Amino acid sequence: TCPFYKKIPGTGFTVDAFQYGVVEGCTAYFLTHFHSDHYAGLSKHFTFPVYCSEITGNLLKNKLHVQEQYIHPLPLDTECIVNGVKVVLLDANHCPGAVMILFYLPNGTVILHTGDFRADPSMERSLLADQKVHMLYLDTTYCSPEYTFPSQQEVIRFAINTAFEAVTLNPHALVVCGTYSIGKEKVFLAIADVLGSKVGMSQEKYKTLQCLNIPEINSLITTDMCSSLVHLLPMMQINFKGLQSHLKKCGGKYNQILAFRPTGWTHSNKFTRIADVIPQTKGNISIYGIPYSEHSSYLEMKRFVQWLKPQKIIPTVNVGTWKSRSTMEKYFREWKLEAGY
């Protein structure tokens, strides 16, 4: 059955709760973003109203084949009424079309659901600042002090300079970027832009990108792999064997590969700076691991919560074991005692 952390008290709403069949009492199902864990269970067979951003609706329509009659896209940063209740969608700074939802309950309680998010100080000058928020449903993916990472911009700068140097030294090098869902598109778009190239990719991946309301998209991407010097492949193929194999498929048009694996955190965040990063190499193939995160670091999460001063926090990630919940509760109490709320 649908957990309490996916229910919004004193409405018939749920959030990211598509895997439990019909939820008793639910009149509107919200979807924060198009990642499979959050959409799990949605298909052409779903017949209840879904509320989401415009980008998330394009994906539902075109990739999942959800029938149009059940898709209710809402604009961002706009007060809207849904089944008699005031709501606002805000940019979550996660993947394309990802939202946080602000719910103004009839009794005067205010609830923020973050969805998946990467907390940023620009969120401190949104509609959130206009009133008190009583309850917070929080993306706790990286809620532990070891989880540090560079800014998105530091990582992109490094990627840009690395790629530019490699292709200027060898104009027959190919650049490959690994991918498994939406998100982290700036990695491959910024590399292509510095090399004067479109990004080449499979038909399924191109169809995904065509849904994302990216300006001038037709000038940036193509299905003609031949004509392009940056290619996208599934993350699982980003290894020496997969990459040599791909290089044989391209028709001797390239004689070297430089590949990037955008990952989350892995244990080597605790020493290395981005400027120290060096690749793994075997022969004419090099692979760089780059920690481009679309989740809050510990420090970004803590700052956001200490600013917001919620009366209660409800975790949405790592809630499956008592040890994790206990550890998280400890950090929330520290934050509260330091900041005086």
**Footprint on this chain of Ni ion (rule: CB under 5 A):** 35, 116
Nearer to Ni ion, 36 or 203 (CB): 36
Nearer to Ni ion, 116 or 300 (CB): 116
User: Are 177 and 229 contacting, i.e. CB atoms less than 8 angstroms apart?
Assistant: no
Nearer to Ni ion, 95 or 287 (CB): 95
Nearer to Ni ion, 6 or 35 (CB): 35
Q: Closest Cα partner for 221 from 234, 237, 235, 208?
A: 208
CB of 183 to Ni ion, least distance (A): 7
> Residue with structure tokens 């990802």?
98
CB of 253 to Ni ion, least distance (A): 36
> Residue with structure tokens 């079309």?
97
CB of 35 to Ni ion, least distance (A): 4
Nearer to Ni ion, 163 or 294 (CB): 294
CB of 34 to Ni ion, least distance (A): 9
CA torsion angle for 200, 201, 202, 205 (degrees, to 10)?
-140
CB of 184 to Ni ion, least distance (A): 11
CB of 39 to Ni ion, least distance (A): 10
CB of 140 to Ni ion, least distance (A): 13
CB of 316 to Ni ion, least distance (A): 11
Nearer to Ni ion, 5 or 335 (CB): 5
Cα–Cα distance for residue pair 168/163, rounded to 1 Å? 9
Nearer to Ni ion, 31 or 156 (CB): 31
What letters, b where the CB count within 10 A reaches 16 and e where it falls short, cover 168-183? eeeeebbbbbbbeebb
Nearer to Ni ion, 34 or 331 (CB): 34
CB of 132 to Ni ion, least distance (A): 28
CA distance readout (Å), 327 to 5, 116, 140, 315, 333: 18, 20, 11, 12, 10
Contacts of 152 (CB under 8 A, 6+ apart): 186, 292, 293
- Element housing 103 (H / E): strand 99-104
For residue 232, the cross-strand partners are 177
Q: Closest Cα partner for 140 from 121, 110, 119, 122?
A: 119
Q: Closest Cα partner for 287 from 176, 185, 184, 209?
A: 176
Contacts of 179 (CB under 8 A, 6+ apart): 188, 205, 232, 233, 234, 235, 262
As to burial, measured by CB atoms within 10 angstroms (0-12 exposed, 13-18 middle, 19+ buried), residue 240 is middle
User: Are 321 and 146 contacting, i.e. CB atoms less than 8 angstroms apart?
Assistant: no
Nearer to Ni ion, 162 or 179 (CB): 179
As to burial, measured by CB atoms within 10 angstroms (0-12 exposed, 13-18 middle, 19+ buried), residue 84 is exposed
Q: Nearest residue by C-beta to Ni ion?
A: 116
